[PDB]
Symmetry: none
Subunit: 120 residues, 3 copies
DNA sequence: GCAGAGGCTTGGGGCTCCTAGCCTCC
DNA sequence: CGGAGGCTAGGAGCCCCAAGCCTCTG
């Protein structure tokens, strides 16, 4: 098994790939195992989220969410890795949240997930 | 409910408030469940020794790290794991005596990665 | 003005002259100014003091006391350099306490104030 | 028997990064 | 737009020293 490295390509365009940025976005998405995803579904409630949801992805499980306060992409990644028990994890800020959600409800992607429907 | 460690072992602990010192060995005091969890979720510091212990209505996990950490950095670390579980963490100065006192009559030993020292 | 440094020689045998010693004594003696002493007479009460007495030297007064808990001669020396931020004072541990007080009552000196008689 | 010397042991704190927000430019 | 990147209050790691403790010895 690859793991792999980054988000699947079919939605890898909807993401922000900035290593040299300090911008504090409000929208984030993550990619781990459905198990590690299930647990992170609760930890996120430290940044007081307005919305959150976990979807079903091929050979993984993506969970996106949005907070009220702005935060760093790096700040979120560093926060989740605290639970990383030899498990894989990748974090990137979503520039277009509405496009992402609907894309995770297509064919290769399902739901289970969320909390609220429309966004801000 | 219990804030600050019991008195019988408050002499082996460090009660610094305005210190920026970095020590390697600590001791945390939380519920029995958070104790078990923070036993493995602490291996992210590449510890040398960790030992499960128990107390009156709570459990204490003392441990040591090859790297030097601040006592306030350890309380901020466990804080991210717990949410309901009470968190009172103080570094230990007399780790040998501490270890022993937690194996005496009123206490006991549960699990230990490596013997002692 | 003939500014003085260090206790007068006529009593420099009742004092501790240790400079490289980490020892912790009990009885201390300060040699500052008249009102500088009267000041420290209270500012020292922050040390849970048992006995304390103010005497009169020559160029000023001499504060004498005993702390319930031991301390460094340097610990007090530094603590006295906190309030005055001026003037001149000498802080040294008192090796011969009973003998000390005696001379400070002898004619060359005189007692000015003591919260309790020493025993 | 002192009295001075270091042997130790802690907390305080002056620094020097790291972190993770803030921001505005192109 | 969305990166890049400056700016800074706390977080957290360096180090030392102040001020206690102690036993030793000349």
């Amino acid at each position: 098994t690859p793991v792999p490295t980054d988000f699947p390509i079919d939605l890898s365009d909807y993401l922000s790939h900035a290593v040299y940025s300090n911008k504090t976005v409000s929208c984030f998405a993550i990619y781990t195992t459905s198990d590690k995803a299930i647990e992170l579904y609760d930890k996120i409630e430290k940044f007081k989220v307005d919305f959150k949801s976990r979807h079903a992805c091929e050979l993984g499980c993506i969970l996106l969410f949005i907070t009220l306060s702005k935060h760093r992409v790096s700040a979120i990644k560093n926060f989740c890795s605290t639970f990383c028990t030899i498990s894989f994890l990748i974090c990137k800020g979503v520039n277009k949240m509405p496009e992402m959600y609907n894309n995770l409800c297509k064919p290769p992607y399902k739901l289970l997930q969320e909390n609220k429907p429309l966004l801000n």
